[PDB]
Design a protein around this ligand. Sequence first.
Ligand code: PT
Ligand code: PT
Ligand code: PT
Length: 129
Amino acid sequence: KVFGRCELAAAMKRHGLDNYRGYSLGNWVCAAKFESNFNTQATNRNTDGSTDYGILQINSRWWCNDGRTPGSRNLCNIPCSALLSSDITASVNCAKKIVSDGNGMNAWVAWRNRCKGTDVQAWIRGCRL
Ligand SMILES: [Pt+2]
Ligand SMILES: [Pt+2]
Ligand SMILES: [Pt+2]
């Protein structure tokens, strides 16, 4: 599913991401834009052999099992395919564990390099939140 901007804002809001660990909804929407372009089906294979999955490009080294990432943990106790669903619940539950691990949203290098310190409120403009 390729989400609309406001559509993904609403879904992220219902699932408890607005101000989660202090991050306003716009930060989550900006991150999703530059990680996946709002596509729940996005996958990206890393040179280390891990893969990034779904709307927030969650990585198989630590967070999910894909059956092909060597010496990997599965700290979110899900199959990585759960992260490609049109239903974002599994990705949001995983994103909460990741953002809680100590580096906040710096865990998403696209957030650090393209969203951090910018006017991220622009990403929720117009949306009925
Ligand atoms: Pt939803
Ligand atoms: Pt939820
Ligand atoms: Pt856009």
